[PDB]
Design an enzyme around this catalytic site. Structure first.
Site, PDB file in Angstrom:
ATOM      1  CD  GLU A 308      -2.473   1.494   2.583  1.00  0.00           C
ATOM      2  OE1 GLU A 308      -1.950   0.957   3.526  1.00  0.00           O
ATOM      3  OE2 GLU A 308      -3.433   2.267   2.692  1.00  0.00           O
ATOM      4  CD1 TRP A 330      -6.071   1.095   0.004  1.00  0.00           C
ATOM      5  CD2 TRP A 330      -7.720   2.608  -0.043  1.00  0.00           C
ATOM      6  NE1 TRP A 330      -5.588   2.259   0.548  1.00  0.00           N
ATOM      7  CE2 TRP A 330      -6.572   3.205   0.532  1.00  0.00           C
ATOM      8  CE3 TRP A 330      -8.888   3.366  -0.179  1.00  0.00           C
ATOM      9  CZ2 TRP A 330      -6.555   4.523   0.973  1.00  0.00           C
ATOM     10  CZ3 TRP A 330      -8.877   4.658   0.299  1.00  0.00           C
ATOM     11  CH2 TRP A 330      -7.728   5.223   0.872  1.00  0.00           C
ATOM     12  CE1 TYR A 356      -3.398   9.234   3.520  1.00  0.00           C
ATOM     13  CE2 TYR A 356      -4.856   7.587   2.576  1.00  0.00           C
ATOM     14  CZ  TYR A 356      -4.483   8.372   3.647  1.00  0.00           C
ATOM     15  OH  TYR A 356      -5.238   8.298   4.779  1.00  0.00           O
ATOM     16  CB  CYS A 416      -7.353   8.196   8.718  1.00  0.00           C
ATOM     17  SG  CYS A 416      -8.972   7.507   8.309  1.00  0.00           S
ATOM     18  NE  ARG A 436      -9.981  12.048   8.156  1.00  0.00           N
ATOM     19  CZ  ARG A 436     -11.061  11.250   8.189  1.00  0.00           C
ATOM     20  NH1 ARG A 436     -11.958  11.323   9.167  1.00  0.00           N
ATOM     21  NH2 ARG A 436     -11.245  10.368   7.218  1.00  0.00           N
ATOM     22  CG  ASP A 439     -10.213   0.770  14.516  1.00  0.00           C
ATOM     23  OD1 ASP A 439     -10.514   0.478  15.720  1.00  0.00           O
ATOM     24  OD2 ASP A 439     -10.373   0.016  13.556  1.00  0.00           O
TER      25      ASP A 439
HETATM   26  O1  LIG Z   1      -5.522   4.152   8.111  1.00  0.00           O
HETATM   27  C1  LIG Z   1      -6.607   4.241   8.690  1.00  0.00           C
HETATM   28  C2  LIG Z   1      -7.892   4.342   8.050  1.00  0.00           C
HETATM   29  C3  LIG Z   1      -8.998   4.398   8.802  1.00  0.00           C
HETATM   30  N1  LIG Z   1      -8.936   4.410  10.173  1.00  0.00           N
HETATM   31  C4  LIG Z   1     -10.150   4.375  10.953  1.00  0.00           C
HETATM   32  C5  LIG Z   1     -10.632   5.697  11.513  1.00  0.00           C
HETATM   33  C6  LIG Z   1     -12.119   5.378  11.599  1.00  0.00           C
HETATM   34  O2  LIG Z   1     -12.447   4.388  12.579  1.00  0.00           O
HETATM   35  C7  LIG Z   1     -12.313   4.797  10.200  1.00  0.00           C
HETATM   36  C8  LIG Z   1     -12.358   5.808   9.061  1.00  0.00           C
HETATM   37  O3  LIG Z   1     -13.680   6.416   9.008  1.00  0.00           O
HETATM   38  P1  LIG Z   1     -13.868   7.986   9.241  1.00  0.00           P
HETATM   39  O4  LIG Z   1     -12.990   8.360  10.372  1.00  0.00           O
HETATM   40  O5  LIG Z   1     -13.448   8.624   7.952  1.00  0.00           O
HETATM   41  O6  LIG Z   1     -15.324   8.210   9.550  1.00  0.00           O
HETATM   42  O7  LIG Z   1     -11.173   3.910  10.077  1.00  0.00           O
HETATM   43  C9  LIG Z   1      -7.744   4.286  10.864  1.00  0.00           C
HETATM   44  O8  LIG Z   1      -7.677   4.254  12.084  1.00  0.00           O
HETATM   45  N2  LIG Z   1      -6.637   4.215  10.074  1.00  0.00           N
END
Ligand SMILES: O=c1ccn([C@H]2C[C@H](O)[C@@H](COP(=O)(O)O)O2)c(=O)[nH]1
Ligand SMILES: NC(=O)C1=CN([C@@H]2O[C@H](COP(=O)(O)OP(=O)(O)OC[C@H]3O[C@@H](n4cnc5c(N)ncnc54)[C@H](OP(=O)(O)O)[C@@H]3O)[C@@H](O)[C@H]2O)C=CC1
Ligand SMILES: NC(=O)C1=CN([C@@H]2O[C@H](COP(=O)(O)OP(=O)(O)OC[C@H]3O[C@@H](n4cnc5c(N)ncnc54)[C@H](OP(=O)(O)O)[C@@H]3O)[C@@H](O)[C@H]2O)C=CC1
Ligand SMILES: O=c1ccn([C@H]2C[C@H](O)[C@@H](COP(=O)(O)O)O2)c(=O)[nH]1
Ligand SMILES: NC(=O)Nc1cccc(C(F)(F)F)c1
Lengths: 532, 534
Positions: A308, A330, A356, A416, A436, A439
Site C-alpha cells: 500500500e 481498499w 494519497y 485519516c 484525524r 481505530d
Molecule cells: O488508516 C486508517 C484508516 C482508517 N482508520 C479508521 C478511523 C475510523 O475508525 C475509520 C475511518 O472512518 P472515518 O474516520 O473517515 O469516519 O477507520 C484508521 O484508524 N486508520
C-alpha cells in the site's frame, strides 16, 4: 522464607535457540563452548555490573536486624557463580570487583585463591556464609546447573532476566520458569546494542520530605471518580496490566491509550451507526534507532501495508493494482455501492479518486480517472520534501499533506493520515504524523508500522539515520466490538521489538520493491481478531 | 531551638479577592471580608477545598507526630484536625454549620467565655493558651481559619508552617484585608490548577515558611542515561531558582513554561531561515480547559486587540494588509513590503497583498487567487461554513477539519501558514479543538496562537450552540530563538496568576457577525511586560 530474608536474587541473559509459537521460554540460551552464545553485549555487561554492584547503605539496618531475628543473634553485595561459570570469566576481570565472590565447587578449596574470595561445597552451606557476613543483596550470577538447583528449591526472590532478541548456537539453557511460581512485574525500555534488540524484565515470587504528601491530596481535592469504573470495563479482569509496577516498554504507549479510552472514554454512536468510546488528542514517540515498533501483544502482517505504501509512492489511485496482489485494505471503498453512497455515480469501481498517491505526486492537478498520465501535472510534494531534507534540513516547512480540501468529495474517502512533518538534526531524521481518526484496535497498530517504514525510507534515500516517529492521534476511538479482545491484549506482556532491514543499495524513494523490506527477530503473542 | 509551629503543625488557610496600567503583585489578592460576611457571597469550589483541607487526617502519621510533640514537652475515637478562629469569624458562620463538623473548633475571645456559647467549642483568650490546649489534645494538624486580626498576630509570631491561600480572581467591596505577607519570611512552593465557580476563576497556592523492594528496581531500570554534562545545554540551575524551588506546578501556564525549560535544557542547537539560531525540539502537546479559564499567559503582559482584529479579518476571507494597518494592527506589516514580497518572488504582488493566506483558504480553498480586491463569491470551498454545518448536523463526524495548508498556493502566499489545521470534536453539548502548529516561536508567537485559537473555539462553540471544552495545541518544530533566552529565564522565575475569563456578546449567532467589541477579557492579572530581545 529463606530467599526473602537473605535477599537471594538471580540475574541472567537468554537469547533464542535453533508457524512459530512464542512464550516466556523462547528466551533460554545461556552458554556455548564455555562462553556466552552472543559475543559480548556492552549494554548487558553494563546492566549486570550496575545491578550486582549497586548498594543503598542508608537502608541496610532493616536487613541486618531482620536477618538476625531469623537466625537469633564500604558495604557490598554477594555474587554466587559455578566453577565452570567462574572459569570462563577472563583473569583481568577476577574476582568481580566491589563484589563478595562465592563459588560452588565440590572439587576446589579456599587455599587455591585469595582471602576475601569464598568457596562452598553445597547450596545450604551459603545460608551459613550469608548468616555470618556483612552484605546488601545475594545475586545468583549463574551456571545452568547453579540456576536449575537454586530455582527448583525456591531460593530465588526475583529473577533479573535480560531478553536478547536474536538467535545463537547454544549447549546450555535456562530452566522453564513456572508462570504459576513466578510472574513478570516489570518490563524496561527496548534498546539496540551489538546488533540486537534487548530489554530487561523482572520476575517476582508469587504470594500463594513526607510533608508535601498531604499537599498532594489537597490539590487532588477535585478529582471526578470514587470507584464506578467510569465505564463498566471492570479493572479486575486485567490483573496482569494493573499488577505491573514499571511499564517502560514503548508498546505501553499504545496499551496505556487503549486503557485510557476504555476507562475514561466518551460513549458515542459514529458514522457507521455502531458504537465507540472516543477521546481527543494523544502523542506517541517511538525510537526508530533502538527498535521497530511492530506490536508484540498480537500478530501483525506487513506485506499488505508495505505494498500500500509503494502504491502511494508510485502515485497510483488504481484499486485494482492492490487487488491483483491480494492487498484488500481498499476493497470495501472501491465497490459500486460505496462510491454510489459517496454520490460518486460517475466513478469506475476501484477508481478511488485523488487519494494519497495523487496528492503526494500531483496535488492540485485536475483528477480525471485512474489511468490518466498525470506526468508533470500538479505539485510533487514527495520530490519536494526529499530535496528540502537534503538542501534545507533546518526548514520548518518539510510537510507532506494529503488533505486537499478541493478534492475531498472526489475521494473514495478523505484521508485519516492528514500530514507528515519532518525534522533533521545531526544526520538524524524524525517524522510527526497527524491522524484525524484512530481505530485503536485495528487501524493504529498498522498505521504505526507504515509511517515507521516510510521514515526509514525517507531517511535512507536522504543518507540520514532514522530517529523518532511521533504519532499524534485526533479522534482516538475503540469500537465496542473490540473491548473483549483488547482486554486480552492488555494482560499480555510485550516481547522485545524486532528490527527492520532495508536493502541499502536503494537511494531513490521511487526505487523500492517488496523484497527490499525484511523484519528481523519479530517475537509476538498469538493472533486476535478484534472483531469474536 | 526547634520551632513551635513545626512541633504542633500550625497552618493558616484563607481566600483573598482583589479590592476596589495598574501594577500587580500577590498583594493584589488580599480581600478577606465585608460587612462581617464574605465579599463574594459563597464560592462553592473554595468551600469544598476548605472542608477538604481542614478535615483530612492521615492516621498512620499520628504515631510519629504524638512522639515528636511528647519529645518537645518531655512525656512518654477518631483523629480530627483543630480549627482556630476570631470571635467575629465564629459569628459570621451560618448557625447550621456551627460547630465546623469533624473538627475541634477553638475560638479566640475576651468579651465572651464558655458560658456565652451552646456549642462543643473551646474558648481561649490568649495565643499562649492555644499552644497549651494543643499539647493537651489528640489532633492531626491545627488550622488558623482567620479572620484578619487572627491571621495578622499568628503570622506576626511566625506561628504558621505554611499558608494555604485561595486567589479569587474577581473584584469585590471589602472592609477587611489579609496581611501583606513578608516574602523573606514566606515564599510560594506550589500553585494549583485553575477553576471556575460562581462566575470567577480561582487557583490554590501554598506559601511555605523559609515496601522499598520495588524502589531499587527503579534505579536498575534507569542504569543507562544522560549525565549532567549530557543534559546537552547546562545553562545554569541558579537562573531558575524560583521555578525549581516550586514542588507542585499544576497551573496550566506551566504547560507553556515547562516546554520552554525542556527546550532550553534538551534543545538542539540549529540555524534557521532568518539565520538567528535556535534551540529546537519536535512534537509537544498542551491542553487547556477553556470551560475553567481563558489561557492568556500571566508571566508577561499580552494585548489581544491585534490578534482579535486578525481573527475577524481571517473569517471575512480578507488578504488585504491595509485593512489591518488602518486599524493600526502591524501583525502582517513586514510580510507585505516590496523587499519581502520581491524576496518571495512575488514581483507581481501589490505591497500588503499577502496572497491566498488564511482568510482566502478558510472561504475559497481551491479558487485561483488574483488580487486582494477580488470578490471570490462561490469560488473554491467555504471550509468555515462547512465545519459549522458539520458540528451542527453531524457532531460525531471525524472529518471536521479546517486546513490553511493549500500545497497548490504555498509559493503564492507571503509566507506559508504556521497553523496548518484545526480539528473539532463534539461530546455532550461541548466542543474541543486541536490545532497543529508546524513551526512555533515559544518566545513571541505561541503566547498569541494560544489566545487566537482559544477565542476561535469559543466563537465556533457559541454559533453551533455548544459550550467550550478543551483547546489542544500540538507543537511540531518548537523553538526558542537564542536572543529570547535571557528574557525567557526571567519569565520562568515568575509564578503564574489565575487566568482571566473571555466573554462573548451572546446575541451573535452567525460566525461572520462578530466585531471587536463582542470580545471582553475580564480579570487579566499579569506580570510586567517583557521585550524578548533586550
Ligand atoms: O488508516 C486508517 C484508516 C482508517 N482508520 C479508521 C478511523 C475510523 O475508525 C475509520 C475511518 O472512518 P472515518 O474516520 O473517515 O469516519 O477507520 C484508521 O484508524 N486508520
Ligand atoms: N547468561 C548468563 O547470564 C550467564 C551465562 N553463563 C554461561 O553459563 C555457562 C556455564 O554454565 P554450566 O556449565 O552449568 O556452569 P555452572 O557455573 O553451573 O558450573 C557447574 C559446576 O558448579 C559446581 N556446582 C554445581 N552445583 C553445586 C553444588 N550444589 N555444590 C557445589 N558445587 C556445585 C560444580 O563444579 P566443580 O566441577 O568444581 O565441582 C559443577 O560442575 C557458560 O557458557 C557461561 O559463559 C554464566 C554466567 C551467566
Ligand atoms: N476570606 C477568608 O478566608 C476569611 C474571611 N473572614 C472574614 O473576616 C471578617 C471577620 O474577621 P476580622 O474582623 O478580623 O475578625 P476576627 O475573626 O479576626 O476577629 C477577632 C476577634 O477575635 C478575638 N481575638 C483575636 N485575637 C485574640 C487574642 N489574641 N486573644 C483574645 N481574643 C482574640 C477578639 O474577640 P472579642 O472582641 O470578642 O474579644 C477579637 O475582637 C468577616 O468578614 C469574616 O467573614 C474570616 C475568615 C476567613
Ligand atoms: O503564528 C505564528 C507565526 C509565525 N511564528 C514563527 C515561527 C517561526 O519562528 C517563524 C516562521 O518561520 P518558518 O516556520 O516559516 O520558517 O514565525 C510563530 O511562532 N507563530
Ligand atoms: N474560615 C471562615 O470563617 N471562612 C472562610 C470561608 C471560605 C473560605 C475560607 C478560606 F480559608 F479558604 F479562605 C474561609
Amino acid at each position: 522464607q529463606v530467599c526473602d530474608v537473605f535477599d537471594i536474587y538471580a540475574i541472567c541473559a537468554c537469547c533464542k535457540v535453533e508457524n512459530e509459537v512464542f512464550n516466556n521460554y523462547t528466551f533460554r540460551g545461556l552458554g556455548n563452548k564455555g562462553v556466552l552464545p552472543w559475543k559480548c553485549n556492552s549494554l548487558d555487561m553494563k546492566y549486570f555490573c550496575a545491578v550486582t554492584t549497586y548498594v543503598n547503605e542508608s537502608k541496610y539496618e532493616k536487613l541486618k536486624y531482620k536477618r538476625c531475628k531469623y537466625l537469633n543473634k564500604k558495604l557490598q553485595n554477594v555474587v554466587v557463580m559455578g566453577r565452570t561459570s567462574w572459569e570462563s570469566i577472563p583473569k583481568k576481570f577476577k574476582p568481580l570487583s566491589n563484589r563478595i565472590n562465592v563459588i560452588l565447587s565440590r572439587t576446589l578449596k579456599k587455599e587455591d585463591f585469595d582471602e576475601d574470595v569464598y568457596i562452598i561445597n553445597k547450596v545450604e552451606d551459603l545460608i551459613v556464609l550469608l548468616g555470618k557476613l556483612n552484605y546488601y543483596k545475594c545475586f545468583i550470577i549463574g551456571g545452568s546447573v547453579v540456576y536449575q538447583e537454586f530455582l527448583e528449591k525456591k531460593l530465588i526472590k526475583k529473577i533479573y532476566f535480560t531478553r536478547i532478541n536474536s538467535t545463537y548456537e547454544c549447549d546450555v539453557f535456562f530452566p522453564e520458569i513456572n508462570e504459576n511460581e513466578y510472574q513478570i512485574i516489570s518490563v524496561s525500555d527496548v534498546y539496540t546494542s551489538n546488533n540486537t534488540t534487548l530489554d530487561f524484565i523482572i520476575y517476582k515470587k508469587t504470594n500463594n520530605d513526607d510533608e508535601e504528601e498531604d499537599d498532594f491530596v489537597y490539590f487532588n481535592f477535585n478529582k471526578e471518580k470514587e470507584e464506578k469504573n467510569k465505564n463498566s470495563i471492570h479493572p479486575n479482569d486485567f490483573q496482569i496490566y494493573n499488577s505491573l509496577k514499571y511499564k517502560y516498554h514503548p508498546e505501553y504507549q499504545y496499551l496505556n491509550i487503549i486503557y485510557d479510552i476504555m476507562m475514561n472514554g466518551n460513549k458515542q454512536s459514529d458514522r457507521t451507526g455502531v458504537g465507540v468510546l472516543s477521546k481527543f488528542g494523544y502523542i506517541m514517540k517511538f525510537d526508530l534507532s533502538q527498535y521497530f515498533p511492530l506490536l508484540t501483544t498480537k500478530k501483525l502482517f506487513l506485506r499488505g501495508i508495505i505494498e500500500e505504501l509503494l502504491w502511494f509512492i508510485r502515485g497510483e489511485t488504481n484499486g485494482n493494482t492492490l487487488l491483483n496482489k491480494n492487498v484488500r485494505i481498499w476493497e470495501a471503498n472501491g465497490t459500486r455501492e460505496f462510491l454510489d453512497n459517496r454520490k460518486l455515480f460517475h466513478r469506475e469501481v476501484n477508481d478511488l479518486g485523488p487519494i494519497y498517491g495523487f496528492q503526494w505526486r500531483h496535488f492540485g492537478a485536475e483528477y480525471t480517472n485512474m489511468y490518466d498520465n498525470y506526468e508533470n501535472k500538479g505539485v510533487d510534494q514527495l520530490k519536494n520534501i526529499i530535496n528540502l531534507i537534503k538542501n534545507d534540513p533546518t526548514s520548518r516547512r518539510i510537510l507532506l499533506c494529503a488533505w486537499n480540501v478541493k478534492d475531498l468529495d472526489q475521494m473514495a474517502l478523505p484521508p485519516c493520515h492528514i500530514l507528515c512533518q519532518f525534522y533533521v538534526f545531526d544526520g538524524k531524521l524524525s517524522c510527526i504524523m497527524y491522524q484525524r481518526s484512530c481505530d485503536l484496535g485495528l487501524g493504529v497498530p498498522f498505521n504505526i508500522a507504515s509511517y515507521s517504514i516510510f521514515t526509514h525510507m525517507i531517511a535512507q534515500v536522504c543518507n540520514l539515520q532514522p530517529a523518532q516517529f511521533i504519532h499524534v492521534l485526533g479522534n482516538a476511538h475503540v469500537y465496542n466490538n473490540h473491548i473483549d479482545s483488547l482486554k486480552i491484549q492488555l494482560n499480555r506482556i510485550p516481547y522485545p521489538f524486532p528490527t527492520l532491514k532495508l536493502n541499502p543499495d536503494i537511494k531513490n524513494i521511487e526505487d523500492f520493491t517488496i523484497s527490499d523490506f525484511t523484519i528481523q527477530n519479530y517475537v509476538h503473542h498469538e493472533k486476535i481478531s478484534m472483531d469474536m
